């Protein structure tokens, strides 16, 4: 399974190449939601992955780790850093990754609206509220909240995730949990790197 992330090494330095390779399998899974109304969250994650790749691909040795990108871009472009280039793209990407995490985890934990137990709208909304909303002005909130309102049925979403293979609903859930392990750990380290490096900005778009 190629969306599975590597374990963290002991020094916690995330290698850019394998990271980019693994998360770039995430955007296509937005199609499992069904609707093309979710293209805003999908396209955003995607675009940020591409911008980080654009920098990385110019010089994989120098941009070997995620930390390298931040330190090097600070050297190249001190006045505007961290509001620059791949540093900024990763700043936004982590929030989108956290959104996905907290969404999936909430599903696995079995949180639900008792009034609408086969939807995943509460899961999406809680994910958006904790990960992204505080960084979005009203117009972008309008866009993201319209789309969450097309959240599919839980059973459909899970059936869709496990297409091509023969796997029960709680086998599919077991697979989500497994993915969440190194995925969650990596996200935590990215957030922590942003705080440690004074790279975190809180403006709204
Ligand atoms: C898919 C449309 C939703 C817009 C969300 C916003 O975030 C963007 O904001 C910054 C500009 O400050 C870009 O650098 C990011 O790449 C992007 O996610
Ligand atoms: C929000 C859509 C992203 C889903 C990612 C799930 C991948 C891991 C489970 C197979
Ligand atoms: C089918 C088109 C939906 C477009 C939303 C950006």
Which DSSP string do the residues of the chain spell out, in sequence order?
-TTPPPPPPTT---BHHHHHHHHTTSGGGGGGG--GGGHHHHHHHHHHHHHHHHHHHH-TTTT-BHHHHHHHHHHHSTTTTTSSHHHHHHHHHHHHHHHHHHHHHHHHHT---TTSTTB-HHHHHHHHHHHTGGG--HHHHHHHHHHHTT--BHHHHHHHHTTTS---HHHHHHHHHHHHHHHHHHHHHHHHHHHHTT-------
Best residue for ligand 3 mutational test, from 30, 39, 47 (most atoms within 8 Å of Cβ): 39
Asked whether residue 2 is assigned to any structural domain, the reply reads: no
Which residue positions form the known binding site?
44-51, 136, 203
Cβ neighbours around 101 below 10 Å, total: 19
Asked whether residue 149 is assigned to any structural domain, the reply reads: yes
Ligand nearest to the CA of 104: 2
Counting the structural domains of the chain, the total is 1
Asked whether residue 84 is assigned to any structural domain, the reply reads: yes
CA distance 159 to 73: 43
Asked whether residue 202 is assigned to any structural domain, the reply reads: no
CA distance 16 to 66: 5
Q: Which domain holds residue 67?
A: 13-197
Cβ neighbours around 90 below 10 Å, total: 27
Asked whether residue 204 is assigned to any structural domain, the reply reads: no
Asked whether residue 6 is assigned to any structural domain, the reply reads: no
Closest ligand 2 atom to residue 38 Cα is 1
Can you give the length of the chain in residues?
Answer: 205
CB distance 117 to ligand 3 below 6 Å? no
Asked whether residue 180 is assigned to any structural domain, the reply reads: yes
Q: Residue 104: name the closest of 35, 50, 32 by CA.
A: 32
Measured from CB, residues less than 6 Å from any atom of ligand 1 are 40, 43-44, 47-48, 88-89, 92, 140, 205
Asked whether residue 3 is assigned to any structural domain, the reply reads: no
- Domain with residue 69: its CATH number is 1.10.3520.10
Residue 183 CA, ligand 3 centroid: distance in Å: 28
């Amino acid at each position: 399974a190629e969306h599975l992330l590597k374990p963290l090494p002991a020094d916690k330095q995330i290698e850019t190449g394998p990271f980019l390779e693994a998360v770039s399998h995430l955007p296509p899974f937005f199609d499992c939601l069904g609707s093309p109304v979710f293209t805003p969250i999908k396209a955003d994650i995607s675009g940020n992955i591409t911008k980080i790749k654009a920098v990385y691909d110019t010089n994989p040795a120098k941009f070997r780790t995620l930390q390298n990108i931040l330190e090097v871009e600070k050297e190249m472009y001190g006045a505007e850093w961290p509001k620059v280039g791949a540093t900024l793209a990763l700043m936004w990407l982590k929030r989108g990754l956290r959104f996905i995490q907290v969404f999936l985890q909430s599903i696995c934990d079995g949180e639900r609206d008792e009034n609408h137990p086969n939807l995943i709208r509460v899961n999406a909304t809680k994910a958006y509220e904790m990960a992204l909303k505080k960084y979005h002005g009203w117009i972008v909130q309008k866009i993201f909240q319209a789309a969450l309102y097309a959240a599919p049925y839980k059973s459909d979403f899970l059936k869709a995730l496990s297409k091509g293979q023969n796997v029960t609903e709680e086998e599919c859930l077991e697979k989500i949990r497994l993915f969440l392990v190194n995925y969650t750990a990596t996200i935590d380290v990215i957030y922590e790197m942003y705080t440690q490096m004074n790279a975190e900005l809180n403006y709204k778009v």
